[PDB]
Amino acid sequence: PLPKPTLWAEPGSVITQGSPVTLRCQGSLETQEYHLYREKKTALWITRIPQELVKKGQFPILSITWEHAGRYCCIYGSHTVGLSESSDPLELVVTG
C-alpha cells in the first residue's frame, strides 16, 4: 500500500478552451512508472502520450477541448516494489 502520488495541473486545473495544460504526477522514484486515468469515462487522449513523457509523469494537452474535462487520478509503482494508491482526484475544468 505505497503512499499516494501528487497530481497537479500546470498552469492550473481551470484552463480556458483552446489553451494548453499539462497534468503532472510525482510519487517517489525519479521516473518511469506513472499511470493517469479518468474515472467515470476513459480519457483516450492519455493513451497517446509518448512513453518518454509518461515516464517523467507528464501528460500534456496542447489544445484542451470540452471532452477533456473530468476527474483524474494517477498511481505509480514498479512490478516490485508494487503499485501505489490513487492520488487525490484532480478536477480538470474547461471554460471560455
Residue numbers in the entry: 2 to 97
Task: Show the paper's wording.
LILRA3 is a soluble protein, the only secreted member of the LILR family, and contains four Ig-like domains (D1, D2, D3, and D4). As opposed to Group 2 LILRs, Group 1 members display high sequence similarity and are predicted to bind to HLA class I molecules (HLAIs). Further, LILRA3 is the only non-membrane-bound LILR, and its function was predicted to be antagonistic with HLA-binding Group 1 LILRs. Here, we report the binding properties of the LILRA3 D1 and D1D2 domains to HLAIs (classical HLA-A*0201 and non-classical HLA-G1) as analyzed by BIAcore® surface plasmon resonance (SPR) analysis, as well as the crystal structure of the LILRA3 D1 domain.
Based on the previous observation that the first two domains (D1 and D2) of Group 1 LILRs are responsible for binding to HLAIs and to determine if LILRA3 interacts with HLAIs, the first or first and second N-terminal domains of LILRA3 (D1, residues 1–97; and D1D2, residues 1–197, respectively) were expressed in Escherichia coli, followed by purification from inclusion bodies, and renaturation via dilution refolding method. The overall structure of the LILRA3 D1 domain has characteristics consistent with Ig-like domain structures and also displays properties unique to the LILR family. The structure is primarily composed of β strands arranged into two anti-parallel β sheets, with one β sheet containing three anti-parallel β strands (A, B and E) and the other containing four anti-parallel β strands (C, F, G and A′). Like the crystal structure of LILRB1 D1D2 and B2 D1D2, the D1 structure of LILRA3 also has a pocket-type hydrophobic core surrounded by the C and E strands and two 310 helices between the two strands. Most of the hydrophobic residues on the strands and the 310 helices face toward the interior of this hydrophobic core, which causes the hydrophilic residues on the adjacent loop region to protrude outside of the core. This hydrophobic core not only contains some important residues for direct binding to HLAIs but also pushes the adjacent hydrophilic residues (e.g., Tyr38, Glu40, Lys41, Lys42 and Glu68) to assume a proper conformation for its binding to HLAIs, unlike the residues of Group 2 members and LILRA2, where the two 310 helices between the C and E strands cannot be seen by helix-strand transitions. There is also a disulfide bond between cysteine residues 26 and 75, which clearly indicates that of the two neighboring cysteines (Cys74 and Cys75) in LILRA3 D1, Cys75 provides the correct conformation for native structure through its disulfide bond between the B and F strands. Some polar interactions may not exist in the LILRA3 D1/HLA-A*0201 complex because the amino acids at positions 36 and 76 were replaced with histidine and isoleucine from arginine (Arg36→His36) and tyrosine (Tyr76→Ile76). Again, the crystal structure of LILRA3 D1 displays that Lys42 forms a hydrogen bond with Glu68 of LILRA3 D1, rendering Lys42 unable to bind to Asp96 of the α3 domain of HLA-A*0201.
